[PDB]
Amino acid sequence: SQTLRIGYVSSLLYGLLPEIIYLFRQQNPEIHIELIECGTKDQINALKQGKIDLGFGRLKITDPAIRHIVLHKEQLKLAIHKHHHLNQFAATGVHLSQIIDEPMLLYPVSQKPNFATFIQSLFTELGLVPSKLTEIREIQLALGLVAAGEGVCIVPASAMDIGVKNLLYIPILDDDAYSPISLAVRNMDHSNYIPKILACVQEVFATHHIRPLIE
Template identity: 30%
Template sequence: MNTKQLTYFLAVAEELHFGRAAERLDIAQPPLSRQIKQLETELGAVLFNRGRSAITLTQAGERLLKRGKSIMSQLEDTQLEIRRLGQGAEGRLRIGFVGSATYGILPNIIKSYRASYPEVNLSLVPMNNAGLHRALVSRELDIAFARPALKDSEFVTRPLIEEPLIAAVPDNHPLSSGETLDLSSLSRPNLVLYPEYPRPSYADVVLGFCEAQGIDISRRVWTMDLQTALSLVAIGEGICIVPGSVGTSQRNGLRFLQIEPALGHTSLSVNYRLDEQGLHIRNFIQIAQSVSRNMP
């Protein structure tokens, strides 16, 4: 039994009249009758009681009518689901991101994507760059927001934003009353750095900029993530060099100061596998780039 035969059977079973069923199906009555007879032969069961003035369903026909409606309904639902998946309107996306991305562009990208594709399930996982790289390689992630980028010949990298580095200092820091901080004026500053491993990492970018300007980097406090680093700064363990977007969110015990002279810049990128052709990812990347272009 194929779907064409089942469609013909359902039309006759619902109309209980071969002529009306043939008209509904837009075919001639003789081919319809032959199809029903062939179906009965294949199934080994009579589906209709054929009288002179009317036809009725046999027990086998009633059962097939019930099951056939369910089968066709499931088939239609499946076709719709597959079509919507193909259009990128349903499905899932697994997104990894460095913690600092949540202070800037990432929330706006997620909001914009959800507005356009509300039926797509989003899984959001914070990771450092090393974790993002491993997860993309193993296909545990579909998209990765990295700082500055993930270097791999199998990845596509799309730059999103570039922002200055600023200083997070305790709110009782002697220099916290101003709006800027000259790092070279500090005597052996205690630098709170993240992540501690694996290396190289964002911390090495910061250390490289400091070394280039002759800033003393001998005193270091290591931690694994941005949130812990900011907590350590808030209790007076040192200062932390962070992306400028982090300073847009106020936090008790902290002040964010512009660094003068400027220490350097950091960038955020969105990365995905070169062999990934899914429409979900293409749609997400387009929205991410659109949001980044409209950022002030």
């Protein structure tokens, strides 16, 4: 009997992660499981300290003690209210240099590096300096607020299915406009539950026909 403790960023609950856990549970019934919400940075510390054994996240934080496997690179979308003047680019899509002056929401509020600093790093890379930014606690608030008419917000593709009403998700046409889904584990951790969970990720992935091999 092993209690495997898994860290996750919230937006992954709307993708394939729950299936992967479900699959893992059915295949490994003796291994009990706990899920904890925490940012990618906090997972490094959680992992290092042994608070969690696996970390599913959105950022590659390089570190001696941490082995980091990129699972899938997911396109980014700009979330808007359905009446916002960027409607017209629903089909074609937008470059980030076209919305530098738009009131924008970043998320989450957390110890850096965040998904917030990930986006700001994308702006820097693309020579862009956003004039109107606001930080919001977590993703569902951000989207709620976009629906409430408080600006636009860059999110990953799988945020589309979240359930907040009256939104549109404009494609982002930039080359670097992708958010990597990754699994962080302890470099020294040689437990069998690591390759097992990786087997599940691949099994689910293959069923959904998104199957380049990981690693």
